[PDB]
Ligand binder design. Structure first.
Ligand SMILES: [K+]
Ligand SMILES: [K+]
Ligand SMILES: [K+]
Ligand SMILES: [Mg+2]
Ligand SMILES: [Mg+2]
Ligand SMILES: [Mg+2]
Ligand SMILES: [Mg+2]
Ligand SMILES: [Mg+2]
Ligand SMILES: [Mg+2]
Lengths: 120, 241, 50
RNA sequence: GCCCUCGGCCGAUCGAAAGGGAGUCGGGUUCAGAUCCCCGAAUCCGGAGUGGCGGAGAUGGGCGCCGCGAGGCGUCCAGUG
RNA sequence: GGGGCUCUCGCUUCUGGCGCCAAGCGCCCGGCCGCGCGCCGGCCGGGCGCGACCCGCUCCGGGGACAGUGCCAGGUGGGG
């Protein structure tokens, strides 16, 4: 006495949808991250402009993987050089490589970091 | 006496152009899915169209009383399922080993199911009572059975529900079931069923052959026709006498 | 545009839900904005009524 | 998680570096880059569960009393400017 | 009085307003103290029905064994 239809439209009733519970993983193991931080940072630039950035703007110039973004470049430089960076500016060179201008934090100096990196 | 004076009725009238209509039932006016429309229009078509008696005979099914006593008798002769057949076989194997061996033990009467199994029993005169479902959806598997049962002389009845016959044989659907020989304490009950079945189906098979179905118009068509029949009869009556 | 006949925008009340229905009637000559037009079997003979 | 209730962009999607579309400007700097770098002033959007600080809401009247008065206690009534 | 009997078996027209997510009534189901004798004192919540009549086989209306479609037959056919 209560099954009522106040609408002249029939809609498909909502039926529950089960979450996948596979009996075997399709791939046996997850593939390791190929874009690790050693892959992100390839080599630093040592041109005259790169040297000018180090002792003017406290900035390290790097050649990075083209698929790495600013967040990934920021983390990569932080762990394998133990420095803190302020911001990362990124461009893709006409030759196809990606170049990152990594400005260090004020408490870090880009000159001694470049000295211990080995790109003086 | 203590009723708060602020309470009062606020009736809303649902006349045309006034307060919006209430959420009333619209089931009759629903845009239904095509599968619902198809099966409802199929039912109406069977009512409109001339239904040949060979197809219309299945509309005449057993009454609720007689169906109950028939299924009640048929429940005493259900085919055994997979579980107790194993128990029967395991008991037979151990009894065979120690030490009777064969021990036929008078294989009990059982209900025979399936249209192919039953039709061979009817042709062989070995069926005592045939029960046919009324809603065999591909209605060619059983259109011949009522005539075949009549000629062979075996009493036959039509029951509502192939699912009920299916539940009788532990399956989803059974088209027909047949009564082979029956136990002595059930012979009287089977006899009470046969003569009533035989009066309603075998004895009046001649006018079952000629009883067409359908050919009934829709209520709107009937009502307006009846309105016209009443429309002039209200002055023909004044005309006469 | 492309029609040499003015169109009248007429707003009705939806009889079944709380909403306003907007129609695009072809304007009969003499009807003006702010006029009430009445549509139905029981509407009376006036310019614009349906 | 399920149930009840409510729920028509009534049509996926694509389609503009001149249409719509929030919010960056001034100065300096290179051999070649800048409204993007540096310096200095802003600004938009998004986020803050444990709530970051303030301010608003919001903090007044009535009656019994104490108290010279001012000011205090109890109760009742307000209070989405 | 009034029934076979007819229209109604109706709630909207002077205004460039507003109008939904039920008031009301009835029947109940929980918790509270408690007359402490049960339909029984009163307080917080929840449900159903009438409000919003019943029944029914095509959503409503217009055509309709025609139109139309398939195959063949005759005519027309520098449009090709
Ligand atoms: K654009
Ligand atoms: K031709
Ligand atoms: K031609
Ligand atoms: Mg799967
Ligand atoms: Mg860029
Ligand atoms: Mg929709
Ligand atoms: Mg696009
Ligand atoms: Mg230039
Ligand atoms: Mg030619």
């Amino acid at each position: 006495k209560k099954k009522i239809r106040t609408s002249p439209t029939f809609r498909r009733p909502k039926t529950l949808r089960l979450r996948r519970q596979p009996k075997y993983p399709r791939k046996s193991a997850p593939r390791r991250n190929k874009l690790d931080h050693y892959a992100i940072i390839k080599f630093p630039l040592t041109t005259e402009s790169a040297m000018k950035k180090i002792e003017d703007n406290n900035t390290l110039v790097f050649i990075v993987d083209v698929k790495a973004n600013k967040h990934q470049i920021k983390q990569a430089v932080k762990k394998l050089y133990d420095i803190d960076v302020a911001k990362v500016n990124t461009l893709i060179r006409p030759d196809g490589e990606k170049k990152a201008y990594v400005r260090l934090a004020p408490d870090y100096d880009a000159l001694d970091v470049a000295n211990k990196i080995g790109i003086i | 006496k203590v009723v708060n004076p602020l309470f009062e009725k606020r009736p809303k009238n649902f006349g045309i152009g006034q307060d919006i209509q209430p959420k009333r039932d619209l089931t009759r006016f629903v845009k239904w899915p095509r599968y619902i429309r198809l099966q409802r229009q199929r039912a109406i078509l069977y009512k409109r169209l001339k239904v040949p008696p060979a197809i219309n005979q299945f509309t005449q099914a057993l009454d609720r009383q007689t169906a109950t006593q028939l299924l009640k008798l048929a429940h005493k002769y259900r085919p055994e399922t997979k579980q107790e057949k194993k128990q029967r076989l395991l008991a037979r194997a151990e009894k065979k080993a120690a030490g009777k061996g064969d021990v036929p033990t008078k294989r009990p009467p059982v209900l025979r199911a399936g249209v192919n199994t039953v039709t061979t029993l009817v042709e062989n005169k070995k069926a005592q009572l045939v029960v046919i479902a009324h809603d065999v959806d591909p209605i060619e598997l059983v259109v011949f059975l009522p005539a075949l049962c009549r000629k062979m002389g075996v009493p036959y009845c039509i029951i509502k529900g192939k699912a009920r016959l299916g539940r009788l044989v532990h399956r989803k659907t059974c088209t027909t079931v047949a009564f082979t020989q029956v136990n002595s304490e059930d012979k009287g009950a089977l006899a009470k069923l046969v003569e009533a079945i035989r009066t309603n189906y075998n004895d009046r098979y001649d006018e079952i052959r000629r009883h067409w179905g359908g050919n009934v118009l829709g209520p709107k068509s009937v009502a307006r026709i009846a309105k016209l029949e009443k429309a002039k009869a209200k002055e023909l009556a004044t005309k006469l006498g | 545009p492309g029609r040499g006949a003015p169109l009248a925008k007429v707003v009705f009340r939806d009889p079944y839900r709380f909403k306003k229905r907007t129609e695009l009637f072809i304007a009969a000559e003499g009807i003006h904005t702010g006029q009430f037009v009445y549509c139905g079997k029981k509407a009376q003979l006036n310019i614009g009524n349906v």
